[PDB]
Amino acid sequence: PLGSMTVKLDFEECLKDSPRFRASIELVEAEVSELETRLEKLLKLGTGLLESGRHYLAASRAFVVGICDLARLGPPEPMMAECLEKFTVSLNHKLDSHAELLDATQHTLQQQIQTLVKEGLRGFREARRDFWRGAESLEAALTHNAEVPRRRAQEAEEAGAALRTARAGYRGRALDYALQINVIEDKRKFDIMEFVLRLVEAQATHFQQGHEELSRLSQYRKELGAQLHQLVLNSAREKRDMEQRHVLLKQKELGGEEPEPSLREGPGGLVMEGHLFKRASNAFKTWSRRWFTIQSNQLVYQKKYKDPVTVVVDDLRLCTVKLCPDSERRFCFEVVSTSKSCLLQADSERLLQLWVSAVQSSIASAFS
Amino acid sequence: SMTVKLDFEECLKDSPRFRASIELVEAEVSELETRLEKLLKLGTGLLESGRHYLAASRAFVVGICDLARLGPPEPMMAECLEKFTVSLNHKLDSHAELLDATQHTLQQQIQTLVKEGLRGFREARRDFWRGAESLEAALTHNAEVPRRRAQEAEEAGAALRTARAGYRGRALDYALQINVIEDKRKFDIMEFVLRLVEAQATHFQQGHEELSRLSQYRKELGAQLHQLVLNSAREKRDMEQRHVLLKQKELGGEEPEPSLREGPGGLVMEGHLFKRASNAFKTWSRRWFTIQSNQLVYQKKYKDPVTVVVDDLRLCTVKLCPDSERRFCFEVVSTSKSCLLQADSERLLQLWVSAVQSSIAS
Amino acid sequence: PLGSMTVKLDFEECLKDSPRFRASIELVEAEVSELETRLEKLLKLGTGLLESGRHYLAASRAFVVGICDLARLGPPEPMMAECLEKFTVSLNHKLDSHAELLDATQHTLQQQIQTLVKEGLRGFREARRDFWRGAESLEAALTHNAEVPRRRAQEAEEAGAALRTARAGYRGRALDYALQINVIEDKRKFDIMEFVLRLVEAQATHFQQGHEELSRLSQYRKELGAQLHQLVLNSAREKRDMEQRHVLLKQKELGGEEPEPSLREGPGGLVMEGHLFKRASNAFKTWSRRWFTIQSNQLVYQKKYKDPVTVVVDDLRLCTVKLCPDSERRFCFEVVSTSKSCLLQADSERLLQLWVSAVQSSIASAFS
Amino acid sequence: SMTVKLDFEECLKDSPRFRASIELVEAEVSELETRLEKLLKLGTGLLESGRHYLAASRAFVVGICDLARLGPPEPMMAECLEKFTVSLNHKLDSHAELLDATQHTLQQQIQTLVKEGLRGFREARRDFWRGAESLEAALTHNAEVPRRRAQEAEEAGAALRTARAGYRGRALDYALQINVIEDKRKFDIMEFVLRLVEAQATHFQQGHEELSRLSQYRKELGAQLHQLVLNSAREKRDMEQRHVLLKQKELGGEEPEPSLREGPGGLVMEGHLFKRASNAFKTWSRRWFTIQSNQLVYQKKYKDPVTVVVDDLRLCTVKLCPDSERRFCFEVVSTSKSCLLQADSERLLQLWVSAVQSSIAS
């Protein structure tokens, strides 16, 4: 027949013990050790594939959260809000299926290859042990059969009776070796075929779960896509419209005068904010700018944009404004009270007029 | 955080709604770039992990192949076992094309965005804060005007004018880019996701076509496999059952008997014999001897040239040694060379003595 | 039944695997290890007996040579000359037979006890190895049968099918252990009985070879003995006769005068020996005694009993004797020649007269 | 060497035949004593070697005895194996009596001869050479006489007279002892050999009487031994032949099934179960459990006191657990104590659940 250990083991000389037969027993064994190292190399690689597999999916699962989270960090688009949720449950669904494929991999390696190296050479190596012990027994059997003198007939007959023992039971041991090598030639091919069966089985099972919802994924891929191409043409147009209006402001209507602080919530909330230059009444003294706010009849400044406000004067009920006639600088006015009295300057003619008006107005509310 | 679509009204009047929107869009740009650039190193790492995975698989598929050339080269092994493993390598290469296309995807969108996608926002912003630096300075400058003065007033005020007009033109460019970033952060990330989902999906579509045919192959072969090994289970038990019958009933204790039968040039016989060594103690040793073409040779290893024991047999005599101490022995004495020898039975003595004795008559 | 391993191994629970059965497998083994150390102690003692045996006969064989050689060194008795030869061949004959008994001892220890420890526990310990491997297999078989969840029905059925494997083939392994312990209980008793059979066999064979010539030895023991008792009565009488004659010489006839030198072989051999006192002719000179001899007409002296003789004068043909009238001492005579001339003195009146006569006589022969 | 029976003629005339016989008898006495005293240390060494031999044997016969008390105490072992080995010890003690009698023999003759058997020869010899010392001196003295003198002549000569008479009486005593030594060296050595040959011979005579009856015992038992072990050879093969028939045809894969059958106080069942440990992980473990006298106990080692699992069964309930994850499990819940348990089959669940359920009705 055509088997790899079959064609290099001599069945025909197996009761007969020629140097040929001793050569085949030795020769066939080399494949046995070969096959056992290749089985072991396959188990080591199997955990390497399990290790990298489980790291490729840990990297993948972080990526899918992260791709979604970034889109979620953006300004919102409703088709994306629902499609991204369909994509998310589907994407993770492939990773838990492919993680199952590893565990399946791990399992088949245990059922098959590990069982195979663990169980499958035990009964042949124990038959090998006793066969070579019997060889040993046969050689001393021959040794004791040859060295007797012909005059000591009874002793020699006793020694030849043990040789009939050695030779027979060595034929008996040789048959068992023959049986057991004859099992592993048929067995080796099937088990590893089974292993490959179970490999491409889990693959077929994994692509089919991912192929099965493919229609649900494909409707969203189109409906997100048709919407994105209308959005881009809509943004093109909106930004065309925005570039031309951007153009227009710079052409002829932008203005050079300071913009005006806008009062709201009538004279008793009187909400108005704007910067001024302030100066105190110390003997050595200087100007700095602060951002001012009249809110709830309360005049307040803040050293910075993100600083909490502080009162220019605690209460503004007993205060009076002086529009200076004589001031070192143009556009200066002065604000006088029980304590915290101070000098102010504004940036242009209408801001001075308004700021003094609004602040004098707030004094009327407060005083009311 | 701030409101979407920031328009020019607020920009040009230096509103606190503008003032806070510019505060919050810059802080959004630092978060965004960091997360994009993290998503960039993580998508880098994913390809590296995929590619380590495909090499891990590629080495595992060579280990299943190695079994296959060791084995016998029969039809099911020769064709099926090869079609299963080549389909495994084909799938690794296709999957390589998906990691090549993921890389393309990532180098197109996310690399470009990190590298040169914030660059005109940062141009507009540094030019814009430059405008307000100069306007902060010219508001100071505008304020250092003595009340007596009029030529200093118009001179100071002209410097404030151009500072304010330019801050406003610079404001229009920051605003417009704040709208461009806002749609770019939506569309570059939406196209990225949709490209990736699209290209993953085709690999399964095409995959399943083939691997569902391979499922069919698997279940058909796998069905032949369970019966084949049941067949075997019966087979090697039948063999064991003959063997205990062989051992109990037909097992032989007698020595293997050599055969004196014609070949290419006359009678041939080959077999074990004991002889004495050439060491100083002359110690006995077992070798395999052949009678062929009127010659006696001895084999020194299996599959290696033989050594001659007697040059010719037609010039030999054969000693049946009746007065020797040694048992089952004969001596062959030829003109150039002699050899004592010893056999395992009285049958084997007479059969080796008769074979040499017919040989001496050739 | 009544066997030592039989009555502490539970056949009845051997398919059934109770803690009792696990306890018996363990319990019975302790006797197995016991029996193997006692077999080994018997082999060590066997070479000690071989070592001392071979030294007791090396000491014995030297003694038998030495007992004979001492008798052979004595003054000779003819019945002893033949009986000692019969005793010698018979005595050695027991030592070569008892040396054969050792070699026989050595042989039986190899055939029996060494074969027994070498071959006889191999197939039971290999059955023990696989039985406890099957136990191992059974425990993980139970382990994998118990830890499956009830929802995973197919997987659990597969795991229980392997347990039907484990349990069955463990029953199969248990039977082999049962077979093989059941062989060693019958076997242990016989082999060591055989060993004791072969011991007292070689003894019976040794006393019978030594009992078989006992009649030949017994005739010599008597004939040497009857002769020794006549010899002692004969020696008693001979020594009585010798004591009384010893008595007689001292009583009345011993004599006080110097004994006389006895000439023989006539005047031309003239053989006569006796001491004298000699003096040379030197100017400072003195007396000493030497033992003189006239032999073959040659007058010679010797400084000692065991010294070779030297000539008083080379030749005695041309010499003359002077019987001194004037001499310092009594009984002196003088002997004159061509060279070596000298003065002599003798011990008493008849020795002087004779010595001068004999020496003058020898001169006449010589001169003839 | 010299002639035998040395008589008084030669002695009293101071002959050279005497003069050489006295030279050679003293040299024979030095050889003799040395060889006797060597024969004395070697006969010492022989007893020491014999006694080392009897102790070597005595320890070997205890090693064959040790087998015998290990074994079964059956009639052939009990009586024959003991009669063989006690005959071995009996023979050691008899042989001890022969080494005691060899020692007696050696201390009687050869020790005495070395110690005090040369002593009167050495007395006579030193007294005799003393006589010749004085006669050598008085021959000198006899010779120092001036020729003129007559009173010196008779005075010197009288000293020579008594010296010569006494040398002659001393000569008679050396001579007579030279005859006594000559017969003593023959008769002490002849009696020694004959005593030894005589006493060796009786031990075989008596030995063979018994050991030839023991040969008879040996061949009769030994004949029962070859058939007995042929009988056995058939026996254990018959057993092997049933066993391959048992394995092939009757071997069972099913779990051992417990039995619910009445005893001293009602229904009894005992058997393996799985339970959960009291460690912090709560890890599962297999123990052997007994239901007896309305109680459930568990065994903690073979042949050692048991531990109670539930105090009473008439106060228990029994959970068939249909919604549990764990397979083939039940729970027994009693007032003081509960226990989860797990069995190997759906048969064993129902049988352990029914046994507790009959027990709950007691």
Side-chain angles (χ1 to χ4, degrees), chain C residues 81-334:
Chain C
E82 194 173 270
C83 286
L84 184 61
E85 294 291 317
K86 310 279 174 178
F87 293 173
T88 298
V89 69
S90 192
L91 283 163
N92 273 307
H93 186 204
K94 296 178 179 57
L95 296 185
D96 288 293
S97 173
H98 199 90
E100 200 171 12
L101 176 151
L102 303 161
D103 275 1
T105 316
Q106 193 160 358
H107 191 261
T108 182
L109 193 79
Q110 186 64 247
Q111 193 183 62
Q112 292 43 85
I113 304 311
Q114 177 60 214
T115 306
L116 199 73
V117 76
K118 196 173 92 65
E119 292 303 295
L121 292 157
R122 187 183 289 120
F124 192 48
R125 283 164 175 179
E126 282 286 282
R128 197 271 211 199
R129 188 162 60 73
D130 206 51
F131 183 50
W132 286 24
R133 197 151 76 140
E136 184 176 67
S137 188
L138 186 67
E139 193 179 303
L142 298 164
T143 305
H144 292 293
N145 191 60
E147 294 289 313
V148 69
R150 60 171 73 194
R151 62 195 147 97
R152 298 165 83 159
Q154 301 177 19
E155 290 167 277
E157 195 79 68
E158 173 174 40
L163 176 58
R164 298 312 192 185
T165 314
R167 183 61 70 203
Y170 181 75
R171 275 162 179 153
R173 289 153 156 165
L175 297 156
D176 299 334
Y177 178 109
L179 178 61
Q180 286 280 17
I181 223 288
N182 201 287
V183 166
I184 192 58
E185 178 55 47
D186 275 85
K187 194 196 169 42
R188 67 196 287 200
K189 51 188 181 195
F190 297 152
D191 274 304
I192 69 95
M193 182 55 88
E194 178 173 356
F195 189 62
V196 167
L197 288 182
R198 276 290 80 74
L199 297 170
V200 307
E201 194 192 61
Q203 195 167 64
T205 293
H206 185 56
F207 279 57
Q208 200 190 306
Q209 310 184 340
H211 188 261
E212 180 190 68
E213 77 181 273
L214 194 104
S215 54
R216 90 180 184 168
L217 198 78
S218 304
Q219 200 68 71
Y220 305 109
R221 175 195 167 186
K222 177 260 162 171
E223 287 292 279
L224 195 76
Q227 180 65 73
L228 181 68
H229 294 291
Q230 192 176 293
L231 293 178
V232 171
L233 190 67
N234 294 340
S235 190
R237 306 165 178 175
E238 186 180 75
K239 271 62 177 174
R240 177 56 173 149
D241 193 276
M242 212 93 171
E243 196 171 4
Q244 278 181 281
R245 192 163 54 91
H246 174 103
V247 170
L248 187 65
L249 304 162
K250 287 181 177 177
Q251 198 161 95
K252 55 178 174 66
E253 57 193 72
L254 197 68
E257 191 60 61
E258 308 286 279
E260 190 172 288
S262 176
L263 59 98
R264 58 287 177 199
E265 297 190 68
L270 206 58
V271 195
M272 195 186 100
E273 66 281 82
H275 302 70
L276 290 162
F277 282 103
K278 187 175 60 67
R279 200 179 72 187
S281 222
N282 295 88
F284 305 120
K285 51 177 166 288
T286 195
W287 298 94
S288 51
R289 191 164 180 92
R290 297 297 171 221
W291 184 37
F292 287 74
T293 303
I294 320 181
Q295 196 165 46
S296 295
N297 306 147
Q298 193 78 294
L299 181 49
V300 304
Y301 64 111
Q302 37 177 113
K303 274 166 301 299
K304 294 181 199 172
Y305 184 51
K306 302 215 69 73
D307 181 42
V309 297
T310 191
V311 307
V312 182
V313 274
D314 302 275
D315 206 77
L316 186 67
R317 199 178 168 66
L318 308 195
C319 189
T320 200
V321 194
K322 289 157 77 175
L323 181 40
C324 311
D326 291 313
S327 62
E328 295 152 56
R329 289 166 168 207
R330 83 175 168 159
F331 312 135
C332 294
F333 58 113
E334 182 168 284

Side-chain angles (χ1 to χ4, degrees), chain B residues 282-299:
Chain B
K282 298 103 201 196
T283 54
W284 294 72
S285 173
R286 194 164 187 87
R287 287 300 182 265
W288 171 290
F289 286 87
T290 295
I291 318 178
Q292 54 174 103
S293 323
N294 314 311
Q295 186 168 104
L296 188 88
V297 303
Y298 99 91
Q299 174 164 259

